[PDB]
């Protein structure tokens, strides 16, 4: 699934370099604006789900901030499966024979219980 830049990492915060083949193409640098790519120095390190992302079961967004207990917090996070690409709250899925495996390098990312 398509994701958006996090807007908080070194790459996202830094200004466009004005020198790479993509900056040179941008109108703001006097180019024709045909390639339409981002500056090569601004490739987000940890892209996040889009603001419209919701759980495929309950149709709600992340609610991890409303809960303080760690298990409950995790279960109200949106998690996207890296294998089947479903976005869900882990608490909206009950499976006996499997649990999911969280990926710590990307936000809201796991292999869900259906795929693991």
Kindly write down the DSSP assignment for every residue of 101-114, as one continuous string: EE-SSSTTEEE-TT
Sole binder of Zn ion in the list 25, 29, 44, 74 (CB under 5 A): 44
Closest contact distance (angstroms) between CB of 89 and Zn ion is 3
In the range 64-103, which residues lie near Zn ion by CB under 5 A? 81, 83-84, 89, 92
Task: Please indicate if the annotation marks 109 as binding a ligand.
Answer: no
Residue numbers belonging to the annotated binding site for Zn(2+): 6, 9, 12, 17, 20, 23, 39, 44, 55, 58, 81, 84, 89, 92, 112, 115
């Amino acid at each position: 699934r398509r994701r958006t830049r996090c807007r908080k990492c070194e790459a996202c915060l830094r200004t466009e370099c004005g020198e790479c083949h993509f900056c040179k193409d941008m109108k703001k640098f006097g180019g024709p604006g045909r390639m339409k790519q981002s500056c090569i120095m601004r490739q987000c390190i940890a892209p996040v789900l889009p603001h419209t992302a919701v759980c495929l079961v309950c149709g709600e967004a992340g609610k991890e901030d409303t809960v303080e207990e760690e298990e409950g917090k995790f279960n109200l996070m949106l998690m996207e499966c890296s294998i089947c690409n479903e976005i869900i709250h882990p608490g909206c899925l009950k499976i006996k024979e499997s649990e999911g495996v969280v990926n710590d390098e990307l936000p809201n990312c796991w292999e869900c219980p259906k795929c693991n």
